């Protein structure tokens, strides 16, 4: 069994093979598209309040399998078990939040046209094809699926090939909730199967969460097929610390921001840009706090980090570390693959990272922090924006005026001032530049895949 | 002077060559990209109220050359002079409308996050590349340029090669208004130049109004370069008349909707779908009302129709008519090229048009009406959605409940009930399916090319 024929699950903590699943054939793809078409046809006619109730049924079904879901996440991609439980809880609360606030976001919108002649309606678009990654096997799916389905659309998941056990579990949860299989479906399609579905008329639009290379390859096919796409393609988020900052809170938020999910977060704090006056105190405190993180078996709740999900990606990450050191960076912590059958990489800190270095120009999708010195606040802003990515950012300073001014000049989709960066249903999510385009969550995730339809009566 | 080397303007009323313009070279492309990046860098730092005032300056500069602009539009693409003056007036009013209402649409947006810790901000994205067509040489530019610039973005126009006289005049209007260097620019680029700019990092996003073939070609490039794009690619709008409709008003709106701008409108009434009970009366009234339209020299205000804009497109439209007649349709009016040096095509009506015929499946971008009989309202809805396009639609019926129900099932971005289909700053514009995606005008045209940015303080 090889990836050329099957999707393979391997426990990254032990290296043992878990499951295999062959790619969907031509009959599977045709059957999936037929049921998605029939499902949307009936789902688009349901009441908005009925769909809001079905969202609550999803949240109830998810909580009824919360531990079964979290264990599957931890087993397949190595997430610490309490972070997998938090992912389940966050995904279930998302169902309840959209159930309460979603309908009001989908109400018809009045216009300034006289005599109440014109309103704006949010109509369903069709079946949305979703390409999702492995770092949050449940949350990445629910973040789009919940608002997409509430808007009357269908959702067809093409999950990452190393988390198909999570994909089947999610499908079972939707089945438990009474969601018709044409409204929520899934396929184990290879890249050619995705290309075929993008060209198929039964797919209305596409959404992609993954690498820059995956978004560029899929975004070109969606544009060629005249399908709207939303791309969320990770980032290299800057974490700015000025001299007047709450240093202790900044270090806590820096450590959590970088090493959450063993570093494998799109909006993780990756480029730490510290003003020169406070850089020595920050660096020493950051290394001390990163060194206090326990790493090991993700089923053991005492471990803050588990193994990295993919063996090839740990090799890639370590190669990036070696290149950055060879270019002139200094190693302050970790920086070597752990011996054993597990895919473990320890918390790592690189200092003296200049903008020409690998760890500054590429996404470090693992437990490796890069620390860059800034001459002043203007240099820090320039350093923050000197990146191909632009998903999110953090600024730590007690001068809230300068913080508001820097936020307005940061080329990214989210700015956190003196706090922990995270995605939340109540705020928009998504970035600019090579991080992609399109916004998720809040009312943005509801409207991105809606036919915004003007209805105008008696225009005479 | 071959189109392979020059952009050529030809007066369609006479056939005389007006002007030539060589394609921009590599230097000209690089120059404009540099000035656009420099212009945006300074424009994004200005106050919103300053830019709103400059919008009022654009409207003043446009009205100051209103007759010069309208005569240029009529001369280069053949629009009747009164419709060209109306285009100028509608474009200037768009400047004042966004100047008044735009700033409020760009204010920070509150969230449900407790204690007012998180707001949504609408930041500029960058320089927007615009690919525009010849049917509304001014309005198509202003519909995007006014909101795009107001939100702090830059605007780089690649106009259609037969209306470069209009493009230069438009640039003179922005220069008269004092719009800075690089905020509004334009290039006489060929298709390779557009490809070069899409791949360039100084272009943040693309917008395209034109054919389906152009949108698929440009949209594929935008996705491959990870640039968001908005595509408005014309349509084959259905015009449904049920048995209980106000026949007199329906006929007036049908004629106005089809033969406006000599039929060269993306949201024109193209496929007339009439219930069998009223079909005979509607058809006879439509032929008689279309026959009362005067056609001739577009500088003469008595003429409701001018010549078609492009000689090759009249040849293609007539080929579409000949194919539809050969497929079984009946000719009720017009249906033959006018002899002479002008590019004149008379008002044309085709009856017995079935869904398998050319005039039903392709866009008839000229003064040719296609009439299809529907058995009942359910059949009319099926006939309306049986199309690759989906820009807009019209329903005429005194049963307003049935009209609203059909509007919810019409696969298009705009539905007009008992009125005249048109675009308006106060409502959304844009469609679905092969008509493209994304919305223009109102707050949609402002937000499509904004960096929607979450700003969240003290998330602890
Ligand atoms: N949160 C994120 O944005 C995120 C998540 C995981 C990985 N990544 C980035 O991607 C890197 C590699 O991890 P990865 O290999 O899993 O990313 P990936 O893009 O290759 O996998 C992401 C998803 O896209 C799909 N995909 C990839 N190429 C495709 C194609 N040509 N056609 C159709 N579908 C395609 C994959 O099957 C998967 O479902 C990581 O190191 C990280 O930099 C980002
Ligand atoms: N309002 C509209 O949506 C609209 C306007 C004009 C034409 N059309 C449709 O298109 C048909 C032909 O008219 P047209 O020739 O002007 O359409 P067109 O698409 O060829 O021209 C539209 C614009 O797109 C540009 N363009 C086209 N192909 C391109 C490419 N490969 N790369 C870069 N830029 C490209 C053109 O230069 C022009 O500026 C019409 O008969 C009608 O069906 C629609």
Residue numbers in the entry:
A (entry chain B), B (entry chain A): 3 to 462
Question: What is the paper's account of this structure, in its own sentences?
Answer:
The NAD(P)+-dependent succinate semialdehyde dehydrogenase (SSADH) Sad is a member of the ALDH superfamily and oxidizes succinate semialdehyde (SSA) to succinate. In microorganisms, SSADHs operate in the degradation of various nitrogen-containing compounds such as putrescine or arginine, where they prevent the accumulation of the toxic SSA intermediate. Our results show that Sad is a surprisingly flexible enzyme that is not only able to detoxify succinate semialdehyde and glutarate semialdehyde but can also functionally substitute erythrose 4-phosphate dehydrogenase in pyridoxal 5′-phosphate (PLP) biosynthesis and glyceraldehyde 3-phosphate dehydrogenase (as well as phosphoglycerate kinase) in glycolysis under physiological conditions. We show that Sad, which primarily functions in the detoxification of succinate semialdehyde in various degradation pathways, does not only accept closely related substrates, but also converts phosphorylated sugars as a side reactivity.
Both enzymes possessed high activity with SSA (~90 μmol min−1 mg−1), the native substrate, which was unchanged for the Q262R variant compared to the WT. Even more surprisingly, when testing the substrate spectrum of Sad, we noticed that the WT enzyme was able to directly accept E4P, notably at four-fold higher activity (50 nmol min−1 mg−1) compared to D-erythrose. While we were not able to obtain structures with sufficient electron densities for the alternative sugar-phosphate substrates, we manually fitted E4P and GAP based on the NAD+/SSA-bound structures. We hypothesized that this increase in gene dose resulted in increased intracellular Sad activity so that Sad could also oxidize sufficient E4P in vivo. This was in line with our biochemical characterization of Sad, which had shown that the WT enzyme already exhibited physiologically relevant kinetic parameters with E4P, in particular an app.
